[PDB]
Amino acid sequence: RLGFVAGVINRERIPTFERMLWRVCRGNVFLR
Amino acid sequence: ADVQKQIKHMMAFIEQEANEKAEEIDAKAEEEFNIEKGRLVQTQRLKIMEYY
Amino acid sequence: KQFGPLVRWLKVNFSEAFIAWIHVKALRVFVESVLRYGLPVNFQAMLLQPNKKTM
Amino acid sequence: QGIQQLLQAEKRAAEKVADARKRKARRLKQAKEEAQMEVDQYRREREQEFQSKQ
Amino acid sequence: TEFWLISAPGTWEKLHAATTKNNNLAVSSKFNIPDLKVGTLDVLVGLS
Numbered sequence: 430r431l432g433f434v435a436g437v438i439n440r441e442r443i444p445t446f447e448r449m450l451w452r453v454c455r456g457n458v459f460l461r
Numbered sequence: 462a463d464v465q466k467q468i469k470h471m472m473a474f475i476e477q478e479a480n481e482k483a484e485e486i487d488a489k490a491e492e493e494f495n496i497e498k499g500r501l502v503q504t505q506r507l508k509i510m511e512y513y
Numbered sequence: 514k515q516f517g518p519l520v521r522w523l524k525v526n527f528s529e530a531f532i533a534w535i536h537v538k539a540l541r542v543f544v545e546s547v548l549r550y551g552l553p554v555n556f557q558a559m560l561l562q563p564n565k566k567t568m
Numbered sequence: 569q570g571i572q573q574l575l576q577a578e579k580r581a582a583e584k585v586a587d588a589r590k591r592k593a594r595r596l597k598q599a600k601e602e603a604q605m606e607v608d609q610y611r612r613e614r615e616q617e618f619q620s621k622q
Numbered sequence: 623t624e625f626w627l628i629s630a631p632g633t634w635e636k637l638h639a640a641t642t643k644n645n646n647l648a649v650s651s652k653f654n655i656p657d658l659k660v661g662t663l664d665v666l667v668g669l670s
Contacts (some may be wrong), residue, residue: 430578431477431628450573455548457471459464459574468570471549472577474663477552479581481661483588490592494599501603509610518623539655542629544670550631552660559638562652563624567647 438446447460546556626648630638642650 430581432578455545456467457474457548459467459471459570459664461571464570466551468574471574473552473577475578475581475591476584477660478663479584483584484661486588486592490588490595492597493592497596498603501600502606504601505606506610513614521647538627540658541670542627543655543658543668544666546629546631548659555657556629557634558655559630559635560655560660561626561628561641562649562651564648565624568624568626 450458450460542560546558550556630641638650638652641648644650
């Protein structure tokens with residue numbers, strides 16, 4: 430039904446961004 | 462490989478929400494059925510009672 | 514006089530309190546096992562048993 | 569390659585919640601005109617008790 | 623006395639008996655749990 434938000438982040442923090450997002454959301458999310 | 466697991470868990474979730482939210486409407490389609498029929502029978506019977 | 518009524522009040526309530534403490538664990542292990550793991554219908558359930566100084 | 573797969577299953581769910589609209593409302597237009605059987609029924613029950621008083 | 627509580631989904635319910643093969647660590651009993659009603663995602667995470 431819904432499910433969109435997009436934004437900007439620096440390249441030097443992307444590896445720890447996707448790992449922290451994987452941890453507190455507990456799966457069920459899609460990041461490209 | 463791992464991201465294909467994260468997709469298919471959500472594909473199960475979005476169809477589960479579609480199956481559930483239709484079912485509460487399906488429960489609403491039966492609960493509002495028996496009370497609107499019971500009401501409109503009464504308003505029919507109240508009119509004919511005055512005509513009685 | 515009140516010592517007998519006290520210990521029988523603790524024994525019936527804390528037993529009900531501890532059973533409720535296990536039941537919130539069974540609810541808490543039911544959630545997050547459908548998040549970290551898949552949900553075709555239900556997650557494959559199992560639990561464990563304690564350990565000392567090999568943990 | 570998965571985002572086109574992502575929304576089209578969700579777009580299938582848009583017809584599934586629409587199926588809840590084309591079933592409940594179809595029940596409601598049926599139920600409102602099934603209450604016209606109440607009209608034809610009690611007029612017979614009227615003429616049952618309005619002929620013994622006529 | 624401590625206690626440990628781990629669930630391992632992925633037969634796979636014979637693979638927890640392969641964790642009972644680790645007899646030096648724990649005894650590893652079952653604690654079977656009946657199924658509960660599913661039908662939510664949003665307030666399910668808010669529940670946790």
